[PDB]
């Protein structure tokens, strides 16, 4: 029932994601010199360094907000990919599966703690 525990749990999950080779294309904003048409397709860029910085600045109120930004990294990859078989997109799918597997208990524990707080 710790309402604040999600923050360190998210920091540790982000550390695991940064150790994972599949996260390398997503660690920093997409380079517009490498992908000149990126902003013609993607309206809201997102990357793991921005998520980590937002968390560390105390600019997420809940793990749901962090989860919305991480999911945006994956939906941007899906929207920008020229093929469902592309290398970078395929890395995004594995990383998404790993993230969802680990964020599930973070979200459940937070929501349960908040329900207990408001009982």
Ligand X SMILES: Cc1ccc(N)c(=O)n1C
Contacts of residue 66, Cβ cutoff 8 Å, sequence gap at least 6: 10, 51, 54, 55, 60
Task: Tell me if 80 contacts ligand X by CB under 6 A.
Answer: yes
CB-closest chain residue to ligand X: 77
Separation of alpha carbons 74 and 95, rounded Å:
9
Only segment of 12-20, 50-58, 63-71, 75-83 that touches ligand X (CB under 6 A): 75-83
62 binds ligand X (CB under 6 A): no
99 near ligand X, judged by CB under 6 A = no
When binding is defined by CB under 6 A, the residue of 5, 49, 64, 88 that contacts ligand X is: 88
| Binding status of residue 77 toward ligand X by CB under 6 A | yes
**CA separation for the pair 10, 66 (Å, rounded):** 8
């Amino acid at each position: 029932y710790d309402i604040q525990a999600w923050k360190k749990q998210c920091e540790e999950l982000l550390n695991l994601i940064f150790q994972c080779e599949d996260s390398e294309p997503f660690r920093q904003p997409v380079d517009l010199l490498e992908y000149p048409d990126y902003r013609d397709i993607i309206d809201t860029p997102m990357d793991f360094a921005t998520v980590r910085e937002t968390l560390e600045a105390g600019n997420y109120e809940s793990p749901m907000e962090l989860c919305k930004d991480v999911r945006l990294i994956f939906s941007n990859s899906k929207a920008y990919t020229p093929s469902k078989r592309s290398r970078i997109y395929s890395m995004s799918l594995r990383l998404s599966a790993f993230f969802e597997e680990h964020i599930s208990s973070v979200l459940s524990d937070y929501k349960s703690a908040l329900r207990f707080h408001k009982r």
